[PDB]
Every structure is written in structure tokens, then in C-alpha cells.
């Protein structure tokens, strides 16, 4: 009956907290120095230890997750460190005098200009092909003199031709004293308590694929497709879609480009685009119409679970933004594509003939809101072809004064952190507090 407190060291008690997570990649031996794995990331254990926790119900919140905010700062920090020792193209801001490549009634122009050399007093005049998207006119009245797109606003740095942009799986691990709780619920939406909860030390193989609108090479959802959103009744918040059946998309760059290496200084090597050997064919992506329409139909069935059993659901092309948010932007073999998704979202829903998507290619890119730094993608010599696995979508409503009669959905990509939320929605970092008091009928021996 006489109760006394007792100290228990090692009790299974955790609390929501945010700590510094670190990288982890498997022993991939190989052309190396990819930006994400860097020189050294922690080698993954040969056998991950996932331990299920019975009778445990934990709250999750993919939108207030701290793993996304840290990872977004990690990818950005890795990008600058892989470009600092590379050649900066600040002297490449010379006035360009261009022309059109002999076709009557073009997306690329042949430009000649004076460039610096290995020696200071000697100058060279070189010819190089540029894409129209990376060049703006200087006279607008108009003549035929041009300049680079960034030279007026931000500096430009040429990516080293040794580093690769291919995303490899990255595992985020927790330091000692902290643990990551994975929610294994098949029907788990955005937030809320998760019935089936296990714990792991590192996350699964998350491939950092920088995309827009379409989520490529992402993790599929089990059972039915999932519609996760912070506020479905809010138009300002993006709508994260996760497929269960992956759709296939083949993208190619038929142009047989050539690399024209021209020296612009002592140790400085600038790689421009040489004349295309063969025919001029603009890039494109093919999507199976039978699979895309089927998968899109599977989406509207789950959208009706939040907007009425019977309602009008339509899909249209992106009507807001420019450049990268109106096109499906991604990296493929080194070159950066910008595909018009007008053929994908052109249906209205109520109650083998593949789709082709025209794509445009840039070389001076401004990703992650970066006002100040621009990257020059060197020309990839040869023909590029990649096959991707679109598993998700990032849509956004239009809102308005509609009386819930019709409902429109348009693709968007206002931020990059939505890409990591599609792969961190199930994880949660918590700190372990092993100190716990409890009353028993035990008293310390005086002796």
C-alpha cells in the first residue's frame, strides 16, 4: 500500500522531434562522382532491420514533416558543391550574331562570336549551335544580334562533363538516440493516426528525380491509387497523386549532336554544340493511350470520393506560369527536356496508338528558385533515349464561383518539395526518451 517512485532506464518512450539526418547509399562501384552520392555516403547495411511495433498507433503528418525540409536543403547543397570547381562561363556573355539552320517556313540557331583564348592578347572567332530558349535578342528592333538568357540576370557555371545527373537510391538514416517510424498502412492518406507502425533506421531507396507535373521513377502505391492533400477543399494546396499501375513513357532526342570543345583559358574548357550530323528532329515522348486513359480513369474514380458520387471532372493544360511549370521538365541522359503535356490532360469525365508529347530542350537552367546561379548543361554527344516510369501527378484545382457542378484539374509544380513528400509521407523521425518513473511498493535499502 506504501507506494514509491522507481526509475526505469530503457523504457519504450519516444517524442516528436527534429534532428540532423545523414546520407546513405549502397556499395555501387564504378565514370563516377555523381552529385548525390558525392565522394562518400554512408554504406547501407547488408540487411536492413525493420521491426514491427504491435498495438502502436502513431500520428503522422507528411505536410509538417521535417525530413522533406532537410532533404530539400541537402540536394541544393550538393548541387553547388559539384559546380564550384567547374568552369564558370562568365566570359561567354559576348554579343552573339546568329542565323537560322536551309529550310523554308526552327528551334535552334547557328551563332558566331569572338571568344577569349588560352592567351590574353589572342582572340578567337568560333561558331556554335544554340537553342532558341537559351538566347534572347539584344536590339528588339531587331537586327540579328543576340545574347545568353542569364547574362542579364545571373551568373552561369558549366557543369563538369565527369559528374552524372542520374538519380541513384538514397537512404536517410537516423543518428543514435533517434528512430524513424514507417507507416505501413495500405489505405493511409496524408495525415492521421496510422494503425500498422514499424520502425527502421534508414529509409528505403529514394531516387531524387527532379521533375514537374509528372512524378517519374517514384514508388507506387499498393492496392488502390491514393489522393493525398493537406486540404482537399483548398485550391492553393497542391494535390499529390500516387498510381498503383505504372505508366510507361519513352523519350528520345533524335538529333545526333556533336560536342565541340573550344578552349577559353588556361585550364578552362567550354564545350559547345557542333553541327548536327543527320536530320533535324525535335524531341518527343510517347505514352500509350490505352494505358494512360485507363490509369487516368482509375484516378477520377478516387477523386469522386471527395467531390460527390456523381460530378463532372475535366483535365486541361497548365494555364498559369511559364518555362518549367507549364511543361513536363526532367533530366534524361544529361539534356533537359520540357515536354508539353497538352495531349495528356484533354478529357472530360461524367457519370498501339501512343500519345506523342512535343518536347523542347534547354542548356541554361534555373532550378530551385535559384536567383543568381545558372547551370550550363554540356551537350551530350550522341543520341539520347530514356524510358521512365510515371507513378504520380501533381495537380491543382481552378476554383471559382462554380456551384459544384463541374470541377477542373490542371497539372502544376509550384515547388520541388512536393517530390520528396511523395517518398517521405510514411516516415517520421522521433527521439527516444528512456527515462520513466512509475510507482511500485519498493523502497531503497538503507543498509
Amino acid at each position: 500500500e506504501n507506494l514509491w517512485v522507481t526509475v526505469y532506464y530503457g523504457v519504450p518512450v519516444w517524442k516528436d522531434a527534429e534532428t540532423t539526418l545523414f546520407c546513405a547509399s549502397d556499395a555501387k562501384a564504378y565514370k563516377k562522382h555523381n552529385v548525390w552520392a558525392t565522394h562518400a555516403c554512408v554504406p547501407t547495411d547488408p540487411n536492413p532491420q525493420e521491426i514491427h511495433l504491435e498495438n502502436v498507433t502513431e500520428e503522422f503528418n507528411m505536410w509538417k514533416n521535417n525530413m522533406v525540409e532537410q532533404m530539400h536543403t541537402d540536394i541544393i547543397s550538393l548541387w553547388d558543391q559539384s559546380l564550384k570547381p567547374c568552369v564558370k562561363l562568365t566570359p561567354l556573355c559576348v554579343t552573339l550574331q546568329c542565323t537560322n539552320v536551309n529550310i523554308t517556313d526552327g528551334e535552334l540557331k547557328n551563332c558566331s562570336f569572338n571568344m577569349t583564348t588560352e592567351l590574353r592578347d589572342k582572340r578567337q572567332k568560333v561558331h556554335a549551335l544554340f537553342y532558341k530558349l537559351d538566347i534572347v535578342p539584344i536590339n528588339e528592333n531587331q537586327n540579328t544580334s543576340y545574347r545568353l538568357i542569364n547574362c542579364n540576370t545571373a551568373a552561369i557555371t558549366q557543369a563538369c562533363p565527369k559528374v552524372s545527373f542520374e538519380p541513384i537510391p538514397i537512404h536517410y538514416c537516423a543518428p543514435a538516440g533517434f528512430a524513424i517510424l514507417k507507416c505501413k498502412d495500405k489505405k493511409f492518406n496524408g495525415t492521421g493516426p496510422c494503425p500498422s507502425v514499424s520502425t527502421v533506421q534508414c529509409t528505403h531507396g529514394i531516387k531524387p528525380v527532379v521533375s514537374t507535373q509528372l512524378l517519374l521513377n517514384g514508388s507506387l502505391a499498393e492496392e488502390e491509387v491514393m489522393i493525398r492533400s493537406e486540404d482537399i477543399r483548398d485550391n492553393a494546396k497542391n494535390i499529390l497523386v500516387q498510381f498503383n499501375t505504372p505508366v510507361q513513357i519513352n523519350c528520345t532526342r533524335p538529333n545526333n549532336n556533336t560536342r565541340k570543345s573550344i578552349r577559353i583559358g588556361p585550364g578552362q574548357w567550354f564545350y559547345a554544340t557542333g553541327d548536327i550530323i543527320g536530320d533535324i528532329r525535335q524531341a518527343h515522348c510517347n505514352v500509350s493511350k490505352a494505358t494512360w486513359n485507363e490509369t487516368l480513369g482509375k484516378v477520377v474514380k478516387q477523386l469522386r470520393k471527395h467531390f460527390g458520387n456523381n460530378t463532372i471532372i475535366r483535365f486541361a493544360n497548365s494555364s498559369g506560369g511559364d518555362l518549367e511549370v507549364t511543361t513536363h521538365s526532367f533530366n534524361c541522359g544529361g539534356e533537359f527536356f520540357y515536354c508539353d503535356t497538352s495531349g495528356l490532360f484533354n478529357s472530360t469525365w461524367i457519370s498501339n496508338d501512343s500519345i506523342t508529347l512535343p518536347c523542347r530542350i534547354k542548356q541554361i537552367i534555373n532550378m530551385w528558385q535559384r536567383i543568381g546561379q545558372a547551370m550550363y548543361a554540356p551537350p551530350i554527344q550522341g543520341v539520347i533515349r530514356c524510358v521512365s516510369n510515371i507513378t504520380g501527378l501533381i495537380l491543382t484545382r481552378d476554383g471559382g464561383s462554380t456551384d459544384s457542378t463541374t470541377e477542373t484539374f490542371r497539372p502544376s509544380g509550384g515547388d520541388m518539395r512536393d517530390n520528396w513528400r511523395s517518398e517521405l509521407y510514411k516516415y517520421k523521425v522521433v527521439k527516444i526518451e528512456p527515462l520513466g518513473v512509475a510507482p511500485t511498493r519498493c523502497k531503497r535499502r538503507v543498509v
Partner: protein, 129 residues
């Protein structure tokens, strides 16, 4: 019978307290200025600081080397009115830590003052002769 780290998180406090050694083990164990190296170094110091924090409190409670330590502090009924059968055979350490979370600071303050702040003086005076 071992389940793993945090294996007894959903079991009763009586079944979870028999596996205190499980959570106790996994509690501590040209330029290196890379983003991964700076984070790694700051994480190792963070790990050993959390560990010594709990060991420091167990030092002022006289429970440094023990895993289950009995004291002289009487359990106040205002903290919880449940019985031993309603605590150790109905509640887990998670929901029990949530109920007493409003009193853990008061218990800790009395845990250092009621015994080891008083025993050491009496331990000196009893062993004085």
C-alpha cells in the same frame, strides 16, 4: 525472447520493463568540411550529450548503475489515481508517459531532494562513528 529495438512499445508496462537492456544498448552507439562530414560530427556530439544527460540525472538520484531503482519519494495521488493492476496490466509506457508528463518535472525535482540530497548527509553522520 527478444523482439528488437522498441519491441515492447505496445506491450504493458510490466512486460516492457523486462526489456530495459534493449533500448539501453542502441542509445549511445583533402578537406573533411563536406556537408555530410559536418553533419556527422555534430550528430555524434549530439548523441553523447543526450546520453550523459540521462546519466547525470541518474547520478543525483543515486541510480547511476542500476536499471530499476527504488527511492524514498512517496507517490502522490494527485499524479495518478489508478491502481497497480490498472497501470502495469492495462497501460503502456507511451500512454503512461503522456498522463504523468504534467508532473515529471515535479517528480524529478523531488527525486533529487527527498533522498540523495538528504541521504548523503545522513550517510556521513551514520558512518561518522
Amino acid at each position: 525472447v527478444f523482439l528488437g529495438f522498441l519491441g515492447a512499445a505496445g506491450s504493458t508496462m510490466g512486460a516492457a520493463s523486462m526489456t530495459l537492456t534493449v533500448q539501453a544498448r542502441n542509445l549511445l552507439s583533402l578537406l573533411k568540411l563536406t556537408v555530410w562530414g559536418i553533419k556527422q560530427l555534430q550528430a555524434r556530439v549530439l548523441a553523447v550529450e543526450r546520453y550523459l544527460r540521462d546519466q547525470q540525472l541518474l547520478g543525483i538520484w543515486g541510480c547511476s548503475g542500476k536499471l530499476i531503482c527504488c527511492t524514498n519519494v512517496p507517490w502522490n495521488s494527485s499524479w495518478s489515481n489508478r491502481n497497480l493492476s490498472e497501470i502495469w496490466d492495462n497501460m503502456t509506457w507511451l500512454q503512461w508517459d503522456k498522463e504523468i508528463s504534467n508532473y515529471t518535472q515535479i517528480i524529478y525535482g523531488l527525486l533529487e531532494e527527498s533522498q540523495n540530497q538528504q541521504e548523503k548527509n545522513e550517510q556521513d553522520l551514520l558512518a561518522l562513528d
